[PDB]
Structure 1
C-alpha cells in the first residue's frame, strides 16, 4: 500500500482514494509565523502582508515534519517544489536519509518536480493512476520522470514583490507588475526557475497569449490543473477558453495554498498541463 507525500506548495491536502500527506512550509514576518496547513486563514494572511511594511520570509519543512509524514510505510514517493528555487528538495533528501536508517525494507523516491503547485498536483495524480493500475514501485519510479517531460507550467502574476524580495525573480522582471493592470506571464524553466515570457494588460489579452503558448507547447486537450489566489473569475475564464479551443474534459480549478498564495500573490493564476 504505497504512500504519496508532498510539500504544501502542491496546494492540496488529500488525494481521494490514495494515502497522501502534505508537509507544510512556513511563511513568516518579524511578528507572526503562518504555517501552510489545515489551520491557515489565507485571506487574513494576505491582508496582513498587503499592509505589512517589513520583510517576509518562507522556510522549508523540518526533517521532523518529513519523518512524521512518512509514517512507517515501506514504499513512498515524495514530490517537492523545485530544487532550483527552494531548499525543500534537500530537506526531503535529508529526511529520506534518516528514514532509510530507520526502516530496513523501505524504498523512498524524492521527486524534484522542477516546478510548483499544479504541476506537482499533476505529478501526484499520475503517481496515483500508476499505483491504481497495479504498477510496481520500480516501474513507477522510472516512468514518472518520463511523464514529467510531457508537462508544462504557466503563470500570470499581478505582483512579484514577494518573489523579488526573496531573491527569486529579478527586479527588472518584477518591476513590470508594479504598474496597475499589468501582469507578468511566466513558465517553469528547464532549470526549475521562473522564466518570464512577457507582460500582459488584462484578462482577454492573457487568454490569447496562453492559447498561443499552449499551442507552441504541444498542448492537445489533456489534463489541465489551474490554481488561483482569490481569482476564481480568471481561472474559470481560462478553463472555459481551453475547453472550447482544445476539447479538454479533464480540468480542475481550485484555490492555491499558503505558500503559492504568498509567492503568486493576490490575483495570481498558475496552470499546469500534459502535452504531447
Structure 2
C-alpha cells in the first residue's frame, strides 16, 4: 500500500515493485530552465553549461509539486537531499504540513538523507525491502534511521565549478580540480555536507584510494550503488575493483540525473555503500 517519494537528486524515476514518485528540482541559467524530469536531455544541458559564461542556479521543488507527488496515499516516506546543502528538506516539510491538514488519516515521514544520489537510492531500496517484508509504518519509520548510520557516500569530481559558484564547497577545495587530470575525492560528512578527502591524479590512483576509504569505513561487501555523469568507464572499473576485493554481488552502476549531473559535472562519479 505505502508510497515512496524522493526528490530528483536520487537519480531514479521508478522502483520496480513499489509505488514511487520522483519530484524534480530545476537547474536554470538567465536564459533557460532545465527541469530534472523524464523530458530532460542532460547531454545537451551539459553542453550548454560548458560554454555558458554566466551564473547558473538550482531550485528545490515547489510545495505544489510535492503535493502532486504525494497523491492521496495515507502512508508516505519522502527521501530528500541533505538539509545541510539544500532547501529541499524544508520544502518537503512544508508540503507535509499542508498534506496533513488535507488528509486526516495520513502518516508522512520526511527523511533528510544527509546525502545525495546513490545514498538516497540505498535508503529508498531499504524502505522498499522493509515494506515487502511486511513491516508496519511505525517500525519502518524508526528502523530506517538506524540503517542509515551503516551507509556511506564517496565521490570523485573532475570539476567543482558549479558547487563552488553556488557556495556549496570552498574555493580552495574547488581549485584543486581546476588542474587538468586532477579529481577531488569527497565524502558526505556527519553534517550532511561535502567533506573533501583529497585530490587524485587518474583512475588507477582513485581505485586505490577508494579501496582504502572503504576498508576504513567498514565496508564488507554489502549493497553498492554507483552513479556517473558520462563516465560509465570509470564507474565500471570501480565496480570491478570492489567485486574483486570484497566479494560484492549486489552492485548497480547507472546514470546520474539532472541535478547530480549539474553538481558532480561531466566525468564525475558518486558511490554509496552499506557498511558493517
For the criterion TM > 0.5, the same-fold answer is yes
Deviation at 1:56, TM superposition (A): 0.0
Q: Deviations over 1:241-265 (max 9, x none)?
A: 0000000000000000000000000
Secondary structure of 1:21's match?
strand
Could you say which residue in structure 1 is the equivalent of 2:275? 275
**C-alpha displacement of 1:83:** 0.0
1:40-55 map, 5 Å: 40-55=40-55
What does residue 250 of structure 1 align with? 250
CA deviations over 1:97-150 (Å, ceiling 9, x no partner): 000000000000000000000000000000000000000000000000000000
SS in 2 for 1:155: strand
Q: Which residue of 1 aligns with 2:167?
A: 167
- SS state of the match for residue 142, structure 1? helix
> C-alpha separation between the residues in 1 aligned to 2:185 and 2:223?
21
Task: State the Cα distance separating 1:64 from its structure 2 match.
Answer: 0.1
State the 1:208 CA deviation. Answer: 0.0
Cα distance in 2 for residues equivalent to 1:68 and 1:17: 21
- CA positional deviation for 1:63: 0.1
Deviation (angstroms), 1:161:
0.1
What secondary structure, in the 3-state scheme, does the structure 1 residue paired with 2:226 have?
Answer: strand
Structure 2 segments unaligned to the other structure (5+ residues): none
Per-residue CA deviation, residues 10-69 of structure 1 (Å, 9 max, x unaligned), is 000000000000000000000000000000000000000000000000000000000000
Aligned to 1:210: 210
Aligned pairs, number? 276
The alpha-carbon deviation at position 174 of structure 1 amounts to: 0.0
CA RMSD of aligned residues (A): 0.1
Normalization by structure 1: what TM-score? 1.00
Superposed CA offset, 1:199-241 (max 9, x none): 0000000000000000000000000000000000000000000
What is the CA–CA distance in structure 2 between the aligned matches of 1:52 and 1:247, rounded to whole Å? Answer: 44
- TM-score with structure 2 length normalisation? 1.00
- Unaligned 5+ segments in structure 1 are none
